[model samples]
Target: GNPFQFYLTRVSGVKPKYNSGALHIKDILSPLFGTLVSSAQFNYCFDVDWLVKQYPPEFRKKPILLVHGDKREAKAHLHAQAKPYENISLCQAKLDIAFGTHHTKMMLLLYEEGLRVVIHTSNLIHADWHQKTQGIWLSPLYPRIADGTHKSGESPTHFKADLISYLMAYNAPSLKEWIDVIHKHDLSETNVYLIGSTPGRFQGSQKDNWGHFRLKKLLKDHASSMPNAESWPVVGQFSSVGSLGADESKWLCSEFKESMLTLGKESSVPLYLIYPSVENVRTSLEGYPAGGSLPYSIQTAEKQNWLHSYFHKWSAETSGRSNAMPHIKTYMRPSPDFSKIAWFLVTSANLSKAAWGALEKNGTQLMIRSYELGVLFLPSAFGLDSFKVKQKFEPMATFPVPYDLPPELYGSKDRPWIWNIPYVKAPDTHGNMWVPS
Candidate 1:
């Protein structure tokens, strides 16, 4: 019944002596291992060597498989002063220079029962995890599998396809090794959709299909099966807004449209943007810069209406997470009656093309720039179908809703807020930029 033990550990510093309910990584991870599982395989996309040190020795004593983007960057990493353990197996991968990053944040735990996958929105670093609003989706403990074609009625048909599709993006043999074993399992019981990205070249029609395009398809396919009783609003929340440039009329904006702001073709659902305000940061627990940064420019001269119309300030208190600033990016389309959801996605992607990828004229391939991943949950996950099914959706007891429904709208005076403290001196400028420290 205690909230802290309800899900992913937050507020690590909570002292048990006080009534404050809190727990740390060790408190959560240590118990999950030992007798139940002799060892584990952990692969982190954005491997920060420092955070690996935070785990208790017992946890580290077990085998750990680490993944990092650049070998050069790792040697000089903040925690690289101390050499990683000899037992630590590092899988060095590649990404496009400067433009792409191994941004996927996930962990795979091989237990006696099965492989448990944790897809989340947090850096392994302590600074990123400390009091930062993040979300994690844990797949059920998948029992060891036997090779066979478990038909659709017997299993979840799309699970394997979705997972394999995500892994193929990496193009790493080491990852493929894991994928090989994973392909044997029957994942039909799992109801979440995996949305992943890998840095690569693309042109023609393929560009229109990755990232958000896949997401929209998942929703449309399922929702189309049933008819909507009425129209509802959709909301997109992000940790960062990428540099879309002064003109919001080209590839970048096209990315935003294809991914974040998908106005349904025949539906009249409204769209909203949820992000933090400068005031929220100034008043945050850190009272300076927060966990994530904003690199997007505010196109005021021409796109003023877009800013004033859909922009919003994230609510730390109302969300029942006062200490953390959001690093989690999500999209929500709740049912018209507000009793259940239409579809919801928890991802590591942001609004920038680099995170979601760009679409080309032929719309054939996506000139992907980074590696990102997330899970999409449809009404089926909660034992309900779309509104068209004419059934009510009971909120999934296991799924946590972090925001208040019928979300608060941005005031007319409020503009799109960007954290330009040390990054930039001007706000609402054409081509302003900042680099996170």
Candidate 2:
């Protein structure tokens, strides 16, 4: 049986549409609502008028909540356009000390069934949707209960707890009304795990669940059928590179590795890194125009030998879409047989300590610098909970994997997609050299 065949098909019990397609945020929301429903976006990439044009005339009249970074001037947005019926409000989040912005890309849809939350990785722009690689994670349509059905306060569900926690992280009055609406719904049937980060200086004694630390803790509690982690290799695929400084490079390589492997017993598996390559982009379907702001430096390369040695280029072969560029980030450790994945995360978080967070001096509190969130999919979610929870391992009946196993390794000729200014060393920065801010 071909593992590739398994990936292209749906999970045994999961819905067919949810598993396939580009699942672009725009495409997912277009048909979901018959009438106008409120929605939100972290970044406003496309023009506002163009956004409502795709929907039916009736749907266009519904209000939309648009939240972005600090800004006061109202330009061509619906607020200023005032197209008579165009109802759209805006919110500018408070800036944190670490210069973090609202990086979480999600849409909250209101319907009779309940609120449908879609978390994805892509700017609300034309290019990010038309050609770039992205991923979408959707929560079930949690139905509302009759009034006073459950006497106690909020339901005892991790879904409600985490959602409220993430919204409160903004620590702003603007999101309070939205948060209040969310509190009334019941999310007891929710199955997905939410991993998120909020920017601030955390104390060493506090129980901080943010970034990779949060991811690790969440996985440890829910994921039980971990394979012999040491025998397999861990891999990371990303579009943007972050500023991982010299002082904390070692911890990122070591501590982060252990955090992910906590469920598995000891083993010696190296980490593989996949990023856009200079040659691949230049000769891609779009040619040199495919290049982007994937930043990294020689100093980072020098310190992260484990990551550097295993670095590979994301190939055009990955996406069938013409001019397919990648903006998605994922991490996983495949089983030895390549038939199953231990765990995988398709998120907006990139390969930087800032997005994932680093432990404070005492190595207790995790200091996160951004608002990043994602869903963690374990094998259990696929109906085949675990192939190796017991003595005799059973290969999963159906696996909802995205990337090809034994990921395409880098050849000697390829070089990393680097960032450089001044156009001289435009395509490649590995040889030309650039300073990492």
Candidate 3:
């Protein structure tokens, strides 16, 4: 231990603490070392001082944001919201609770060192800044009344039959309120970003929120119910800006019309149509103000929908029960570099009322929001973005799924078959419900 400390001190010479909070050997390490002295008196302690600084928000790498799913881990989360994956068997040591799947774990190992970090299924994360949405159940404490009544901005989405409430979506509207909290924190700096994935149905949207001039109906009807968490608040403080991309838009103009035509032949369920629109930039960050006024290039032009990118992994899609749609998740669409923006505000808030939030608590009458999750980032403008600004967007390939490409597309080493059973239909859990009928 003495040699290790002496060597480290000689190398860096006991530098004074900068903004970083370093571990104090005397206070926390001494007593713990005392307990272990008898067990192993000569054991050497490696230098860990400089290593700890790599985890700060700005130091993080291409951090991905994964939101939680509904009905998947609801009950388990009710018990413990933070790192809830501990209860599951398959996910035991993995601690993969929500949107953070194999890719997330791989990311941890690549950048943050994957020991075991449990998480809720639903979340909003800014990997660069490390802000996550947990304990969402507390949103009900901040309520709004329309026409002197406790009515959500949108019409009723929750329903009860025989004393059981059915949840339509996993996220709630109070997210707009949280946007203000984001503003206050100053994580809303431009060039930072938030991203999330939507898996479900929606309909009735005409334009992307970034470019849309219309939406008065949505703005007026829902704004009244949105939260005003603080006093005369400045904006640019939170990461409320976001972007959304749809999987369906390209089909209409493409030659292979099957992408939207033959979906849902296997499942007996009816098709659920989903509308498309980008996130509401202004509305999401209304309370949050942009500080250090932007130059003419950024200020006057539209800054919303600035970070939305779609993953067209599936290159091709047919309406029928083919492997095309499932393969689409791998396609990484071209997107604007997030480094240009300041802060991001992605959420489980889809266009639908049910999914965007309107959940209830347990088996009770209280409104229970389906689980939604996301993360926030705060990358210090430490000259990296400038170098990255000119780099061309390069998406090499779609996400590599666990299964091999369909046998029709490839073959095994020992044998080749018409269809690979392993790569056939996706598991029921991954089935996308796009009703053709």
Candidate 4:
């Protein structure tokens, strides 16, 4: 069965029906079988009233906390808009870094029986809840630790430590309550690993504890090694692109790619980047308007012209998300034939050093600017020794890849959709052209 789920799109007249299992934003907010006690919502953008309406009446009455960055009108607007609701309280996350934002989208729900964590790729606005390709990883409801009993099932791989560590990084007094709640829960049922990035200049022993360095350590220790591993391609699919120096060696191919490889790999692996093209956006369900969510600017794209060679068209016909432009970001390494996947990650991090991290000061310190989060899935966590191809009657499970494997490369005439650039050659399907103000 596919562990990951996609958000359902709004239906147009006479359009093909969405998959029966597609999810709505309410599904994430609602309990699987019980009532919610309280919730903490963290994201970059929010429609306060729209968000409150999604919850059950009882849930809306419960104590709620909203965490946002201390930038722009976020602090002021969120405070003023959320004042009417007696249950709603706001916490401002410090964004001292120059260009970083509180970009992690997550929800922590406390239930009468247990606690649940949801990490996803949608903002708390109405439009992001529908009409876009977003990813969600809902953790199994974790039960409370039994009184006067040792937590026997807890293991290092369960990610309880890392989850608490990420929360502690916030250093906000309001988060202490949630951290205590996490400490009281039994998190052994979680099957995926938590990968998070926080803004900091970490050095020495703490350097490998966050961002790309942390991912490198995790892959090196747990990922199963296979023969001819260098032949397997590393795929990165994201909505935005960052300035990765003037050439690939500056960071993209050197540090970032090295962090993505499996253990004991020396040779360079082929890298494929999946991003939408101008035609793809022009013909999407929302036409040129959908490009607003994909914020790759022309200024950044110009500096990294070398990235064009690695581009792959964004197409997800099999999962029925072709017409919806993607806001989700994912990374993985699958077999050359696309029959097996070594690992998969669904994250809020876009294609940027700020979202990941870059080594500075002669590789002695690591600097990451954005707050990002993701979950990593490996075959070993699901009781498989290796992610090898299966026989005719074998019971090997498959990764629920959001896009079709072996993606099509960009054609000679194709150009990536840069948000700021005007496209006037032809109008979109809605008879609209994109001209940035």
Across 253-291, the per-residue lDDT of candidate 1 in tens digits comes to: 455554443424445346667876655554455444563
Which should have the higher TM-score, number 1 or number 4? 4
Task: Rank the models by TM-score, top first.
Answer: 4, 2, 1, 3
Model 4 weakest 10-residue run by lDDT: 5-14
Error of 4 at 22 (Å): 1.7
Cα lDDT tens digits, model 2, 1-437, are: 22211112122222344335435344456655423356555552335565566445656677777766544454345356434444777666555656565677777776655676777777665555554556667666656556668632243237678888888877667577767767777666565667876776666433445788777776676666444556766778887666554543466566777776656322366677778766656544444444543555445555544554567767433234223446767787667765556777777788877788777777756777777877776655555554332211134444344444556667777666665533345443233323333
lDDT of 2 at 279: 60
The worst-scoring run of ten residues by lDDT in candidate 3 lies at 2-11
Off-target runs (Cα >4 Å) in candidate 4 are 1-17, 264-267, 386-396
Rank the models by lDDT, top first: 4, 2, 1, 3
Q: Name the lDDT value of residue 357 in candidate 2.
A: 79
Q: List the residue pairs that clash in candidate 2.
A: 230-267, 380-385
Give me the candidate number with maximum lDDT: 4
Q: Give the per-residue lDDT of model 3 (tens digit) for 88-142.
A: 1112112123332211110111111101111111111222111111111101111
| TM-score preference between candidates 2 and 3, better one | 2
Local distance difference test, candidate 1: 0.57
In candidate 3, stretches whose alpha carbon ends up further than 4 angstroms from where it belongs are 1-67, 72-74, 77-177, 185-188, 192-437
lDDT of 4 by residue, 83-128 (tens): 9988898888876788988889889999999888888888999878
Please report, in order, the local distance difference test score of every candidate based on alpha carbons: 0.57, 0.60, 0.18, 0.82
Question: TM-score of each candidate?
Answer: 0.77, 0.79, 0.22, 0.94
Query: Candidate 4, clashing residue pairs?
Result: none
